[PDB]
Design a protein around this ligand. Structure first.
Ligand code: MG
Ligand code: MG
Ligand code: MN
Ligand code: MN
Ligand code: MN
Ligand code: MN
Lengths: 86, 287, 683, 287, 683
């Protein structure tokens, strides 16, 4: 189970989600991998997943996208989103 | 960012009732049917009654709770226009067109009228509910004020503008156009003060204030439709008046920084004819 | 709602979480089938169409007479042999709403895209059938887009001029000011934008023939020109847009800048006059060192030295002006003035920042004149001489006023066809034809400079579109490498075509011998530095195309020395904000403002996705506001080194950034060699 | 018997500071000593504070409690004049004559000046003590307002008038004379309303109200003496100004229907010098 | 307060119920002794003064070089031999504040009254010592007063033009409008007021090269002219004043009037542009019968008939225009337009009303052109031909543009000296010299018409002063009889001097042979009616002076037929404003506005009683507002019949008199033959 964060350095909401993902890694990092991808430097992956706003959070399970969340989310909402797929 | 600009626009729009001679309206007034004269009288009384609430309560209560010397001055100026200019202007129009006994009876009727009372008391209720140092209650009252200035008056303004666009009752129509021009800027200004409060709120509180504004608009709108049929069916105009109400509701929402609620419609052409400095600190010249 | 607009409205209706970009092709198909074909008048044969258009004062009969009817017929056939299909609804809508010929009642469509292109090609060729077909292939492939005046008015009778912009030098006299107003109104009647240099006008409070403190400064002239442009506003088709340029060392610089303040009173506020500020390197040096600067009174300098203030080198003459008691001046703070500039650009987008020394350090025609000001779009940087208009019945000393004939290369279509050389040469020939056929009787200096300088503007567009459709980020170093290589090739082939035209016609532009082209100073960096791509990904884009090497540049330098150059100026990148829709291209070399533009035409909104925008290249189409402006400055400076004139560089800023960030971007642009800065757009 | 004529007088006196060009005072200002400029700035700043509170608080609150739409219209108009016209005019004067730092400093000086804070505390306290339907609290606030209009402004007015009378600072002086002309009618009007309430009382109650009025006047007077000395000692005029404020205290008492309290004195004579559309018919075309 | 100002304030301090009028002479004495004699630069001799003034670029050298120093000294002695003393303080104040030459720092005074008069006389004589002494006697007796430009700038290097007016015809083209702006600015920088005829400009919504609804009307041209006059504000010392005239049958007449409304928005309102309306008799006829009128689009008429709307007799061609389907127009109400004119004049005093048929009924030069418009003072009525200003490097068709060569007779001093003939002839010679020496290079039509028509303006002032000081009420029939006789004498001697100049120079004005002077039609009423006084009291005023008779007029007619006439126009009564103080006279032939003028100067309140005011003639000096406007119209029409040009006729209205009263006054003026109406002054 992987939480992929599509972000950019200029995106205000993406700066707000960064500390939330660090707390989530401390609490769940034994069962959840967190991956960050900068859409300014990695346009091909952002295009492949159709990600057409940021932050976009993809929950992947064994390489397949099982859930998609757009915009800022608090920690508890991200935990609920990931815990469905653990 | 805006109060001094509105100060300028307000004071340069200053006018007095005496400037427009009213007597020449009797030359077209005498040619209207009974239903036309009745509707006009009732509409006029409706506007008069609502504008009195705005002069005695609406503007002064907002001026009281808003912080800022320059804002209080602009708001005082607007309150002055309601009480000293608009109220005298409506009285002058009435005294010109109807005898004393007819004026007293029309005001008795409109004072008892269910649809006029419903909207008048809804607005006044929100002004009375403002609490000291509570910006949420102030915002709700500002929304009510914008709805009066930019929306509720327009079911009434329709008729004088309709005549004005046809060459009838031109003197009183000129007066109404000046009044309407003041209410437009009042609505825009109070709207900016409401947006200032709205923008200080959380996202959940914002969504809650939006729901308040839309819910209030819906209540007032449904009563406006009834008010409209009650006055305008007898002169066959209600369909077009309804389009004018929705168009002005959208303007009121835009004044509050909200999206339009109603689809765009064309308006009756006769009524249309009537109508961050940061100093350079060095090391910025080197890269 | 129209069916085509409703189908175009389905772009943002996301199914499966993805935009319905395929609905735009459906939108354009519906648009054509239901409006364009139905509202296009059809003739039994091309002969009937041409006869009807010539007889009804739609086309000039002169330009069609050099071809036999079979030649025109075959030109039209080879225009329709392409079977060009518009890729987006907005392209067809913009073309058939702005450029397609319509009847006198504006009810039926007389011109298709392939008919506008055929007529423009026949105008360009001037009697050559093969050249006309070459132009038809060039434009129907959308490799080259003639400027909006040229595309719209070529071969038409109800036309203005084919020149998109004019630059007027205003001398310091009442005769010259009145004649400048007259010429501004005449050229605005022709439809072209007018830019005026007010740096020669003497300051406010100066002396008029021993009568001291009588002048109103340049601001009175701005009011006069503003009302002239309002009056000659092309009857209301498009409001008369004029430009006023003033040197930052002019005394009226603060009054010049205060015209764009919102708080400014109506007696000092202009509304149709765009303002531009010319910043020499001396001003940046003074602001950097925080020394108190002096703005000078131009008439005192003229009396003391005999030359206008903008005609002398500021970097050399500043200390002499300051130490001269006879040169009146007032003390200003250059850093405070820079902050005022930044706040003015933040609040209104004005002024146009022009770095004079950044223009004149690589200006090839400094012997003719230094570039003292730019055009209305801040991209036409040419030498100009002021005209001394004398009294009536007295012969006027006519100077050079810049006339700019614009044309744009579609980088995507030029690169996909592997036709940089042919496109650049054909575009140069077309611009030469436009310059030659253009005469302006009411502007003696514009006409004289058009005949003598023969300066043309060959811009480029769809840079960001090409990069994003090739998986290249606009801020990436690969994008700058591609811009370097592509614009070096464009400059090479433009110079080669200019030299070939000079050889064929036996004549060069006036005062060519004193230019860096004749002395070879222009080609020093080209015979010394190799501009081939440094990235293998970028080099693969130029496959099948001969990239000019150092030896090729040496050969071109020798060829130019032997035969000369026909055009004083060849390359200038205009914003091209209107014709970009028709060509399905991003505007200029600027990054895209929005991935999907929202436009309201009537009571219906019409969304325009960026050319080639899709799911795989969504983040390559990064919006200009989200991009680092330093990277955009780097890109434009990479492009600018291969453009002899300027580039319409628009600054895209966020509301979070302050006036210090704007000043930092301005100073980085000045340091990186940016010649002009067009606009400061805030989101 | 009087509101209509006050309404007409107030609206016919309407003005804006922008009507008066101030650049003509630039030289006579430049020529004053540093002491004179300091006193002048501070004097006008003290006036600005008084008008700020009279416009924001005093006039609107009295308007709220006084019955009758015409009386309310007059009071609303007077309120607008206080903060939208009078208080603002002082900033027009400041912005012409003084650099921003001197302007900033004088507004900081009003905040920390103990006499100006005391007089504001006392006057505004009485305004905010008004209780709905309680005529006695209203009377007390009207006395305070008359004392502000007809007495307290005058320690400030002295100096612009003193210069005007010598042919100095005459454009600023023209503004001040317009302000003074307004305050004179404001003091009379509020005085008449106060007398209405006083005349309803028993003789015993009247005796207490006179005590209140005289005690308040003396308390304000003693504070104004210290304020006057603080401002005018550096320009040598304190004794002269004191005579002027006593003169005006008597006028305030008279506006309230009371006998003069201070003995008559000779005021500086300089300061005394400081004070249709008829249509055509067929018979007009033949002669 | 100054001693002289304090003494002047004792005029209103009433003792024994009478004004202290004798205090005014004490005011002059105090003013001179304490200010003038102290602050006038005194030189050891006239030679040193003349050398100082010419060397320091205060005087021109060319006009003084025509005289030996003995002649100049004799002229100055003649000026000072009179020992002229100002009888009122306001006269000396006006002269030594406005017209007296001061040093470059304005601290001292260089010219006395006897010095300015001597210099003006030396300029007028042009090398003749006896003529210079005659001019000195004429001006120091205050019989004749050269206009403010002529009196101020005669013989001075730091000057403008001696011409007071400039009447420009604006043709219907952008080139012609641009040239109108240029010429307006070039003549405003010279000081004289400029009036423009905008009736030829096509209306709003007209076509520009077969594209419809393109023009923005004459209102845009008024905006351009207003900003041009604002720019040419003559240092701001006297604001740039310009007039715009429009025929009432022009379509833009409503928008032309809408710009003077107070309620008009800043987007239409013009401030520095005075407006005048030209009313043909046809409009008055349409208003009289209360029938719907039509305002025509000028360019449709020009296309249909090949002639401009204002070049065609509307009384004849109005029906042809109305029944012409190819002529565009909209129905209007002539009575509503008259009421709009009346209310506009009540609110702002605008527009000037020009009764075209009243002007052209007795216009001598109708063959050259009909009088289509008047000047800024609404008193010059001359034939003008439009100039077709073509594109650059194309020859322009230069027409005729009118100019003011103004001078005023002081009726009081003229008739006290019993020298109507001598004063009129000397004034005519001086105005001829002013016209000849005027050479304006930047206005081609103005210069051509000055050379060809040789028109001058000889007005009169102090009519009310003379009548009141002789015990005659202004409204009394004896006053009208005196005006009839006096102005018939003035016309007789002006025609005689013009014919004498034509005989002595051998040339007349251009196209004289077609004028009514050559055909004898002008002299019909003079050889058929006797204008000798009908009152014994009035006849005694002319005792000692030969009043021309019918036989004398026949001899003059024969003399004109044999020898011609040098001036196309000779007489026009200007408002005679600030210079009326210096001459101690009432302004123009208008009645006095107030018996004692209350004027503010600095921090002082100054009082100016009208000259000769006292207890005995207090009620003879009736205020203009108290007069019956109908009797003032009678007086002016009595004067108007002897003035070939117009009279600056200002209406003095009470506050109680409505717009119907103003319209009645206007229609009575039209009925009585009044040519122009200047102002509507409401008290
Ligand atoms: Mg010059
Ligand atoms: Mg033309
Ligand atoms: Mn209201
Ligand atoms: Mn309102
Ligand atoms: Mn006040
Ligand atoms: Mn007050």
């Amino acid at each position: 189970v992987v939480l992929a964060d599509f972000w950019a350095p200029w995106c205000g909401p993406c700066k707000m989600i960064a500390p939330v993902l660090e707390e989530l890694d401390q609490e769940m990092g034994d069962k959840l991998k967190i991956v960050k991808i900068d859409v300014d430097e990695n346009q091909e992956t952002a295009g492949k997943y159709g990600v057409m706003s940021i932050p976009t959070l993809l929950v992947l399970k064994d390489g397949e996208v099982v859930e998609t969340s757009v915009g800022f989310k608090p920690k508890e909402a991200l935990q609920e989103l990931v815990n469905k797929h653990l | 960012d805006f109060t001094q600009m509105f100060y300028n626009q307000n004071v340069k729009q200053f006018w007095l009732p005496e400037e427009i001679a009213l007597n020449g309206d009797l030359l077209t007034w005498k040619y209207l049917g009974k239903n036309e004269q009745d509707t006009y009288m009732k509409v006029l009384a409706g506007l008069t009654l609502l504008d009195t609430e705005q002069g005695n309560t609406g503007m002064p209560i907002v001026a009281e709770h808003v912080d800022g010397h320059q804002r209080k001055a602009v708001l005082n100026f607007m309150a002055m226009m309601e009480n000293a200019v608009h109220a005298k202007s409506y009285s002058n129009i009435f005294m010109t067109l109807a005898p004393t006994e007819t004026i007293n009876e029309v005001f008795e009727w409109v004072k008892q009228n269910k649809y006029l009372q419903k909207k008048a008391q809804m607005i006044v209720g929100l002004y009375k509910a403002i609490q000291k140092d509570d910006e949420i209650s102030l915002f709700k009252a500002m929304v009510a004020s914008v709805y009066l200035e930019s929306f509720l008056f327009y079911s009434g303004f329709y008729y004088p503008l309709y005549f004005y666009g046809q060459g009838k009752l031109m003197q009183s129509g000129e007066i109404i156009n000046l009044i309407l021009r003041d209410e437009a800027i009042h609505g825009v200004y109070v709207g900016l003060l409401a947006q200032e409060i709205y923008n200080k709120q959380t996202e959940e509180k914002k969504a809650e204030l939006r729901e308040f504004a839309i819910d209030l608009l819906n209540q007032l709108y449904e009563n406006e439709l009834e008010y409209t049929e009650d006055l305008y069916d007898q002169v066959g105009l209600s369909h077009d008046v309804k389009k004018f109400i929705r168009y002005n509701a959208n303007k009121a929402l835009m004044n509050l920084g909200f999206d339009p609620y109603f689809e765009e419609e064309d308006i009756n052409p006769i009524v249309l004819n009537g109508l961050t400095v940061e100093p350079l600190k060095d090391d910025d010249f080197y890269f | 709602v129209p069916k085509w607009i409703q189908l175009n409205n389905e772009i943002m209706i996301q199914k499966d979480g993805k935009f319905q970009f395929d609905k735009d092709k459906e939108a354009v198909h519906s648009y054509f089938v239901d409006y364009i074909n139905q509202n296009t008048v059809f003739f039994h044969n091309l002969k009937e169409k041409l006869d009807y258009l010539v007889e009804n004062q739609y086309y000039e009969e002169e330009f069609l007479s050099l071809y036999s009817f079979e030649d025109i017929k075959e030109v039209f056939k080879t225009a329709y042999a392409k079977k060009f299909r518009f890729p987006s609804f907005m392209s067809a809508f913009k073309f058939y709403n702005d450029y397609a010929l319509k009847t006198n009642d504006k009810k039926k469509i007389l011109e298709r895209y392939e008919d506008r292109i055929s007529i423009v090609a026949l105008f360009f060729a001037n009697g050559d059938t093969e050249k006309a077909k070459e132009y038809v292939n060039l434009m129907i492939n959308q490799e080259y887009q003639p400027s909006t005046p040229t595309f719209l008015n070529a071969g038409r009778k109800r036309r203005g001029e084919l020149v998109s912009c004019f630059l007027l030098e205003v001398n310091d006299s009442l005769n010259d000011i009145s004649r400048a107003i007259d010429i501004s109104m005449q050229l605005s009647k022709l439809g072209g934008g007018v830019s005026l240099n007010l740096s020669k006008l003497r300051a406010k409070g100066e002396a008029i023939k021993d009568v001291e403190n009588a002048t109103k400064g340049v601001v009175g002239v701005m009011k006069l020109l503003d009302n002239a442009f309002r009056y000659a506003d092309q009857m209301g088709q498009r409001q008369g847009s004029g430009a006023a340029y003033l040197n930052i060392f002019h005394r009226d610089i603060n009054d010049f800048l205060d015209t764009k303040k919102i708080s400014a009173d109506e007696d000092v506020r202009v509304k149709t006059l765009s303002i531009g500020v010319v910043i020499p390197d001396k001003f940046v040096e003074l602001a950097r060192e925080d020394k108190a600067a002096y703005v000078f009174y131009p008439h005192t300098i003229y009396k003391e030295y005999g030359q206008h203030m903008d005609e002398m080198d500021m970097n050399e003459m500043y200390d002499k002006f300051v130490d001269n008691p006879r040169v009146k001046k007032e003390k200003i703070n250059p850093r405070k003035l820079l902050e005022k500039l930044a706040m003015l650009r933040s609040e209104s987008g004005y002024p146009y920042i022009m770095f004079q020394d950044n223009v004149n350090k690589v200006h090839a025609n400094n012997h003719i004149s230094k570039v003292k000001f730019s055009n209305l779009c801040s991209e036409v940087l040419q030498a100009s001489q002021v005209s001394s208009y004398t009294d009536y019945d007295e012969e006027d000393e006519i100077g050079l006023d810049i006339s700019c004939n614009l044309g744009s290369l579609n980088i995507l279509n030029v690169m996909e066809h592997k036709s940089i050389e042919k496109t650049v040469k054909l575009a140069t020939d077309s611009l030469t034809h436009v310059s030659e056929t253009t005469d302006i009787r009411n502007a003696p200096a514009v006409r004289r400079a058009n005949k003598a300088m023969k300066s043309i503007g060959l811009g480029a567009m769809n840079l960001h579109g090409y990069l994003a459709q090739n998986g290249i980020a606009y801020e990436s170093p690969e994008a700058r490498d591609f811009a370097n290589t592509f614009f070096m090739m464009v400059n090479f082939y433009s110079i080669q075509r200019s030299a070939e035209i000079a050889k064929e016609k036996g004549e060069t532009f006036d005062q060519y011998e004193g230019s860096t082209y004749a002395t070879g100073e222009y080609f020093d960096k080209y015979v010394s530095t190799d501009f081939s791509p440094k990235y293998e990904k970028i080099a693969n884009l130029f496959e099948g195309m001969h990239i000019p090497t150092t030896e090729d540049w040496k050969k071109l330098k020798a060829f130019v020395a032997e035969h000369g150059m026909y055009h004083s100026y060849r390359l200038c990148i205009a914003p091209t904000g209107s014709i970009s829709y028709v060509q399905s291209s991003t505007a200029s070399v600027m990054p895209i403002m929005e991935r999907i533009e929202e436009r309201t035409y009537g009571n219906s909104k019409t969304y325009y996705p960026m050319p080639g925008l899709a799911s795989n290249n969504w983040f390559f189409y990064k919006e200009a506001y989200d991009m680092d402006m330093f990277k955009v400055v780097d890109m434009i400076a990479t492009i600018q080194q291969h453009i002899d004139q300027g580039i319409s560089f628009t600054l895209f800023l966020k509301d979070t950034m302050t006036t210090r960030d704007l000043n930092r971007i301005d100073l980085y642009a000045h340091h990186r060699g940016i010649k002009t800065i067009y606009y400061a757009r805030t989101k």
